[PDB]
Amino acid sequence: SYAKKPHISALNAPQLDQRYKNEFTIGAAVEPYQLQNEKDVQMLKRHFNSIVAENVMKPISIQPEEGKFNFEQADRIVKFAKANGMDIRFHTLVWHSQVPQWFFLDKEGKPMVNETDPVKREQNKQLLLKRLETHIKTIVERYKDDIKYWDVVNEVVGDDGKLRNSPWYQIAGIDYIKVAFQAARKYGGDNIKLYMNDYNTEVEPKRTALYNLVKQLKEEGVPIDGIGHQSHIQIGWPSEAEIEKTINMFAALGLDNQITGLDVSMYGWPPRAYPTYDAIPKQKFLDQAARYDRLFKLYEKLSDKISNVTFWGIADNHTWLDSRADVYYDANGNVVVDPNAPYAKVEKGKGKDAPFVFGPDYKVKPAYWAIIDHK
Ligand SMILES: [Cl-]
Ligand SMILES: [Cl-]
Ligand SMILES: [Zn+2]
Ligand SMILES: [Zn+2]
Ligand SMILES: [Zn+2]
Ligand SMILES: [Zn+2]
Ligand SMILES: [Zn+2]
Ligand SMILES: [Zn+2]
Ligand SMILES: [Zn+2]
Ligand SMILES: [Zn+2]
């Protein structure tokens, strides 16, 4: 939007959540250590009214061995949110990544996916489903009074438009999704809100597969209240038109929509990253600000169908996108960022992305001014 507008400390900037408070909550994803850092604490207090765990509420973080529950890290995020009046999202009860392998071992300690006996396969399904229910039961019995929004399952639809063929699906079929939602409703009650969370929700054939799956589950009475759109997006993709079509399509089913992991990468896919923040040209930040301007104008247009927009981080000094920021080098050792250009080697995850409206020094970016205004 504007470059006249100064690069001031975000701790002196108009509050993001208050700008959007009648449209949707504004959330940030966090690690417990950020709650012991003065600037991160002040950022959350000043700008955000919703919170989610980057990592410490994922399955392997909560029950790394059967019967060993580590709630200590998740508790710290819950305590902070309650003390500051923030909504909490739980990420996530079921996922094919960051998930302990003991879930999928049969009683003899062998991988359940290798079982060929159909009678044993059925016993493995029921055992996996029992373990799934106990994991969800224990978590929801602890947090049902504190955590309003739940990513019950994450990424269960494949990018090929089929259900994702994870061990969950190989072993139990579609019932693991039904069991997860039924268990969360049973032990959590009517007041927690249950979401199916995924990325590339705008992209066919994934989008229609997600649509059909949710429609079918709600016809069968499986409790599902909304869709989580991870929204790990780029400056130019996906188009605002396709985002709008997606949000409307699920709203038509009676589903809430939440933007659960928003970041606007500086790069394409696979990314060709700059090696450092300082090397990103100023024009990239202007392009990103214009993208954020259109994006939040669209969220506001659709505000009656969106209850929350959560960024997957606080400020540019910390983003999981850095793990994807591969730096490409030509034969002379110069950085290559042109997506089709010659190159000799790549340094995977060594570069720097810049996906938020707050810079790594906790000063506001052009993208912040683009979404704090009313134009
Ligand atoms: Cl991270
Ligand atoms: Cl800066
Ligand atoms: Zn306003
Ligand atoms: Zn606030
Ligand atoms: Zn630097
Ligand atoms: Zn709303
Ligand atoms: Zn992180
Ligand atoms: Zn992630
Ligand atoms: Zn700066
Ligand atoms: Zn604007």
From Swiss-Prot:
Keyword annotations for this protein? Carbohydrate metabolism, Glycosidase, Hydrolase, Polysaccharide degradation, Secreted, Signal, Xylan degradation
Please state the Enzyme Commission number of this protein.
3.2.1.8
**Location of the active site:** E155, G261
Q: Which residues form the GH10 domain?
A: 10-374
> Does Mitochondrion appear among the keywords?
no
List, alphabetically, the Gene3D superfamilies matched: Glycosidases
Q: What is its main location?
A: secreted
**Which PANTHER family does this chain map to?**
ENDO-1,4-BETA-XYLANASE A, GLYCOSYL HYDROLASE
Q: What is this protein called?
A: Endo-1,4-beta-xylanase
